[PDB]
């Protein structure tokens, strides 16, 4: 289909095609320098410059270097510098620039690439979609929302924009309003709408409102490969890790840790209690919108495997005791933290991001009654000085109906079946 040859590029179709062939047959190095020759002899040719860029890209794949890709990106901008660039070639060159700026993790820039793409092509709805995405990658949810509002303003049965509008509404606690957009987006079956996030959050929205075929949705997502199961709904997974809601210390082999937690638990408690009496600001409320009602706060010592030095000021002996167990301190997919929950609190059913971690709870201050946690179908109890364990990748729910506070200590560990390679490599969460 696409027309990537302007007037002057047609008079050199042969040369460009010769060099394209070299690239297309795998000889990258050959093609790279042929397109360089084209570009010096034809320094305004948009096709030759796209040629240079495309083969820089293939060579970043060749070498798996991100140097290379860094370079192909300025060359993709180069192509748009030039005169009389066919619009097709223009769109392609800048889209690729944005896509590889995301593959490398440069979102602020991808954002400006995509803003410029939307300026240049104000009737393409897909660009406005891909721009709403670029806004979500940086966490700029307001502007994404507007972008999807425009899009829907003018093509209301666009399912991509529906699901993303829904995801945005949900993340803002507009649970009801988000349900119809999520549902319509998914069933639209458009490109971009078959995505685990939308299933996950549509189901959660229903459970919250009291609608019963949330589970509908969860099992279909199971059907289409997003969820390992209907109950285990994490999304940043390593397939085939043993999955079970509840483990025992033995089942994890982390027994030295469990022991060091149970034997030393009063130290841990007492340091938390101090932080609650003299340094209560170190405890920060839960900001992930997981509560129906109530008061819940968390005092975090390790996140993503990095120790919080100011935080360990208030629990030094605890942080010192944990240093000797890298199976949690270097769980870049978990945390170590005090968690206080007060009476009147209900945590919606929910699921963590990842099956890569197991979650350990050491009872510090646990009332006689009121305090319980379901995971899957089994409901359990904390105990002062003892450790519970579960896969928070499974659905789980919590209540706190006692008459005083409930303090636990959360320690996340790598899943036991995960290599030292997987442990050093997996991107942090």
């Amino acid at each position: 289909k696409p027309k990537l040859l302007n007037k002057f590029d047609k008079t050199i179709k042969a040369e460009l095609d010769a060099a394209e062939k070299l690239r297309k047959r795998g000889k990258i190095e050959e093609a790279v320098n042929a397109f360089k020759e084209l570009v010096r002899k034809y320094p305004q040719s948009p096709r030759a410059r796209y040629g240079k860029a495309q083969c820089e890209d293939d060579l970043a794949e060749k070498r798996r270097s991100n140097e290379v890709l860094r370079g192909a990106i300025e060359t993709y901008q180069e192509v748009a510098s030039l005169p009389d660039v066919p619009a097709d070639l223009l769109k392609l060159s800048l889209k690729r620039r944005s896509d590889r700026q995301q593959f490398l993790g440069h979102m602020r820039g991808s954002l400006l690439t995509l803003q410029r793409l939307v300026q240049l092509f104000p009737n393409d709805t897909s660009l406005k979609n891909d721009l709403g995405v670029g806004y979500l990658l940086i966490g700029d949810n307001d502007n994404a929302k507007k972008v999807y509002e425009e899009v829907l303003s003018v093509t209301p049965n666009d399912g991509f924009a529906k699901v993303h509008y829904g995801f945005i509404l949900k993340a803002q606690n507009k649970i009801a309003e988000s349900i119809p957009y999520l549902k319509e987006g998914i069933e639209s079956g458009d490109p971009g709408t078959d995505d685990g996030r939308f299933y996950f959050h549509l189901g959660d929205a229903m459970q919250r409102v009291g609608n019963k075929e949330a589970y509908k949705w969860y099992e279909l997502g199971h059907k289409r490969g997003h969820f390992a199961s209907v109950w285990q709904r994490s999304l940043y997974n390593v397939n085939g890790l043993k999955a079970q809601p509840w483990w025992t210390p033995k089942e994890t082999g982390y027994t030295e840790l469990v022991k060091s937690l149970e034997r030393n638990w009063k130290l841990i408690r007492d340091e938390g209690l101090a932080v609650m009496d003299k340094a209560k600001g170190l405890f920060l409320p839960e900001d992930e919108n997981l509560r129906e009602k109530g008061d819940w706060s968390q005092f975090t010592l390790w996140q993503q495997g990095r120790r919080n030095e100011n935080a360990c000021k208030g629990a030094p002996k605890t942080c010192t005791l944990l240093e000797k167990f890298p199976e949690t301190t270097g769980c870049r997919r978990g945390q170590i933290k005090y968690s206080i929950m007060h009476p009147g609190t209900h945590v919606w059913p929910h699921t963590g991001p990842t099956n890569c971690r197991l979650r350990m709870h050491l009872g510090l201050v646990i009332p006689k009654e009121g305090c319980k946690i379901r995971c899957a179908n089994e409901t359990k109890t904390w105990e002062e000085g003892k450790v519970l364990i579960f896969d928070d990748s499974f659905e789980h729910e919590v209540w706190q109906d006692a008459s005083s506070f409930r303090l636990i200590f959360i320690v996340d560990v790598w899943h036991p079946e995960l290599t030292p390679q997987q442990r050093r490599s997996l991107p942090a969460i």
């Binding site: 490398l104 992930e288 919108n289 991001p353 991107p427």
Partner: peptide, 18 residues
């Protein structure tokens, strides 16, 4: 914004390269 106990953010990892 990070995914600590749930899955609220659009993307829970921050890509950086190969």
């Amino acid at each position: 914004g990070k995914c600590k106990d749930g899955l609220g953010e659009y993307t829970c990892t921050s890509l950086e390269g190969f």
